[PDB]
Amino acid sequence: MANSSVELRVSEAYPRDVGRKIVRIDRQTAARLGVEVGDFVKVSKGDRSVVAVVWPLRPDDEGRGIIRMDGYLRAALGVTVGDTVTVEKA
Ligand SMILES: [Zn+2]
Numbered sequence: 001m002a003n004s005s006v007e008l009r010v011s012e013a014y015p016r017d018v019g020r021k022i023v024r025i026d027r028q029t030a031a032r033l034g035v036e037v038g039d040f041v042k043v044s045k046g047d048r049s050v051v052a053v054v055w056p057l058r059p060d061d062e063g064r065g066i067i068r069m070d071g072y073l074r075a076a077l078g079v080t081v082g083d084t085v086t087v088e089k090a
Protein backbone atom coordinates (compact mmCIF):
# COMPACT_ATOMS: atom_id res chain seq x y z
CA MET A 1 0.00 0.00 0.00
CA ALA A 2 1.13 3.56 -0.68
CA ASN A 3 1.82 5.78 2.30
CA SER A 4 -1.10 7.98 3.28
CA SER A 5 -0.96 11.64 2.32
CA VAL A 6 -2.92 14.73 3.36
CA GLU A 7 -3.44 18.10 1.67
CA LEU A 8 -2.89 21.12 3.96
CA ARG A 9 -3.06 24.90 3.66
CA VAL A 10 0.31 26.66 3.79
CA SER A 11 0.64 29.03 6.77
CA GLU A 12 3.52 31.20 8.02
CA ALA A 13 6.07 29.81 10.48
CA TYR A 14 6.11 30.59 14.17
CA PRO A 15 8.96 33.12 14.59
CA ARG A 16 11.17 30.68 16.52
CA ASP A 17 10.95 28.16 13.64
CA VAL A 18 12.24 30.47 10.90
CA GLY A 19 15.37 29.02 9.31
CA ARG A 20 14.79 25.58 10.84
CA LYS A 21 14.06 22.57 8.70
CA ILE A 22 10.73 22.14 10.43
CA VAL A 23 7.09 22.02 9.46
CA ARG A 24 4.26 22.20 11.99
CA ILE A 25 1.13 20.05 11.70
CA ASP A 26 -1.39 18.88 14.28
CA ARG A 27 -1.52 15.52 16.02
CA GLN A 28 -4.57 14.27 14.13
CA THR A 29 -2.82 14.89 10.83
CA ALA A 30 0.40 13.21 11.97
CA ALA A 31 -1.62 10.18 13.08
CA ARG A 32 -3.32 9.99 9.66
CA LEU A 33 0.12 10.05 8.01
CA GLY A 34 1.40 7.26 10.23
CA VAL A 35 4.14 9.44 11.68
CA GLU A 36 4.85 10.82 15.10
CA VAL A 37 5.81 14.35 15.96
CA GLY A 38 9.57 14.53 15.50
CA ASP A 39 9.64 12.28 12.42
CA PHE A 40 10.59 13.30 8.85
CA VAL A 41 7.83 14.15 6.35
CA LYS A 42 7.92 14.95 2.66
CA VAL A 43 6.06 18.14 1.65
CA SER A 44 5.24 18.48 -2.05
CA LYS A 45 3.69 20.83 -4.61
CA GLY A 46 3.42 19.17 -7.99
CA ASP A 47 6.81 17.62 -8.68
CA ARG A 48 8.67 19.76 -6.13
CA SER A 49 9.30 18.44 -2.64
CA VAL A 50 11.23 19.13 0.57
CA VAL A 51 11.89 16.98 3.63
CA ALA A 52 11.45 18.40 7.12
CA VAL A 53 11.00 17.40 10.76
CA VAL A 54 7.44 17.49 12.13
CA TRP A 55 6.93 19.71 15.14
CA PRO A 56 3.52 20.08 16.75
CA LEU A 57 1.12 22.94 16.12
CA ARG A 58 0.03 24.95 19.16
CA PRO A 59 -3.39 23.92 20.59
CA ASP A 60 -5.44 26.61 18.92
CA ASP A 61 -3.90 25.82 15.53
CA GLU A 62 -5.02 22.18 15.65
CA GLY A 63 -8.00 21.26 13.51
CA ARG A 64 -7.40 24.05 10.97
CA GLY A 65 -5.96 21.86 8.24
CA ILE A 66 -2.81 23.95 8.07
CA ILE A 67 0.91 23.33 7.81
CA ARG A 68 3.27 26.03 9.07
CA MET A 69 6.49 26.41 7.09
CA ASP A 70 8.91 29.30 6.72
CA GLY A 71 9.57 31.38 3.62
CA TYR A 72 12.62 29.32 2.66
CA LEU A 73 10.57 26.14 2.41
CA ARG A 74 7.72 27.98 0.70
CA ALA A 75 10.16 29.35 -1.87
CA ALA A 76 11.66 25.89 -2.42
CA LEU A 77 8.22 24.55 -3.37
CA GLY A 78 7.13 27.62 -5.31
CA VAL A 79 4.16 28.18 -3.00
CA THR A 80 2.75 31.07 -1.00
CA VAL A 81 0.83 31.29 2.22
CA GLY A 82 -2.73 30.17 1.48
CA ASP A 83 -1.66 27.60 -1.15
CA THR A 84 -2.17 23.87 -0.65
CA VAL A 85 0.60 21.27 -0.37
CA THR A 86 0.65 17.51 0.13
CA VAL A 87 2.35 15.93 3.14
CA GLU A 88 3.44 12.29 3.46
CA LYS A 89 5.82 10.22 5.57
CA ALA A 90 9.38 10.58 4.28
ZN1 LIG B 1 -7.16 17.83 -3.74
Ligand SMILES: [Zn+2]
Pocket (backbone or CB within 6 Å): none
Ligand atom coordinates in the same frame (compact mmCIF):
# COMPACT_ATOMS: atom_id res chain seq x y z
ZN1 LIG C 1 -8.70 19.31 -4.44
Ligand SMILES: [Zn+2]
Pocket (backbone or CB within 6 Å): 039
Ligand atom coordinates in the same frame (compact mmCIF):
# COMPACT_ATOMS: atom_id res chain seq x y z
ZN1 LIG D 1 10.46 6.11 11.02
Ligand SMILES: [Zn+2]
Pocket (backbone or CB within 6 Å): 078, 079, 080, 083
Ligand atom coordinates in the same frame (compact mmCIF):
# COMPACT_ATOMS: atom_id res chain seq x y z
ZN1 LIG E 1 0.51 29.86 -5.54
Ligand SMILES: [Zn+2]
Pocket (backbone or CB within 6 Å): 080, 082, 083
Ligand atom coordinates in the same frame (compact mmCIF):
# COMPACT_ATOMS: atom_id res chain seq x y z
ZN1 LIG F 1 -1.78 30.49 -5.07
